[PDB]
């Protein structure tokens with residue numbers, strides 16, 4: 001609950017910062033790609049952002065349709081006077097070109113949001129490159145590719161400090177297959193969060209992600225650990241009060257250990 005809620009706060013502040021960056025130029029017709037949208041847990045953040053068009057895509061067809069129904073549920077509120085239009089696409093973004101699936105092949109995006117997703121595409125080089133292409137190729141110049149991914153530096157640091165192939169606490173466990181072997185692609189580990197799931201992830205060496213993004217003319221805006229990001233954004237008072245409205249003034253030490261494995265990143269498309 002508290003970890004989910006804290007990640008929502010991180011996504012709210014992150015989406016909020018870059019919606020305003022986009023609006024500090026074009027306030028009109030803001031088009032967003034939500035790569036790996038999941039069950040639609042970001043729809044209300046895009047609604048509060050007052051965007052115009054949202055493309056939600058996920059690999060699980062089940063999730064895409066609950067995301068589509070959740071959007072239809074939202075637009076039948078009385079609160080949804082001008083809710084964004086949306087399309088919902090089932091696709092493997094690490095294997096399929098998404099513009100093959102758009103109703104408008106030539107559409108452009110101001111933001112691509114890829115939250116807790118891109119580390120599933122580092123199974124191989126072509127999959128990581130395909131996801132970057134689906135995320136960045138159709139970005140308008142000056143548009144943003146933002147997202148959250150595990151920090152490989154902090155992952156390895158804790159794995160070496162451990163004396164087994166595992167580490168964690170009562171909230172989470174990370175189990176690597178072998179210690180001391182960290183290939184750029186396919187470095188598989190299992191991430192278990194006590195409550196939620198058990199899904200295999202791949203290590204993302206961020207300098208590599210930074211270099212591959214250059215292929216689509218992306219320049220790194222910033223890269224922060226979850227702790228660096230929290231400490232910086234908590235100084236803005238409306239961020240601080242959003243934290244208190246969401247009931248996040250008291251995260252456990254065990255929850256900080258879990259959430260401090262992650263980083264946020266932002267790339268911008270050049271002219």
Ligand SMILES: Nc1ncnc2c1ncn2[C@@H]1O[C@H](C[C@@H](N)CC[C@H](N)C(=O)O)[C@@H](O)[C@H]1O
Nearest residue numbers: 036037038058059060092093094115116117120
């Ligand atoms: N290659 C892939 N292409 C598209 N979606 C994927 C892919 N791999 C995993 N996903 C989906 O990415 C999502 C990962 C979730 N942790 C993120 C959900 C949502 N974006 C959130 O921030 O809450 C899941 O819904 C996956 O089904």
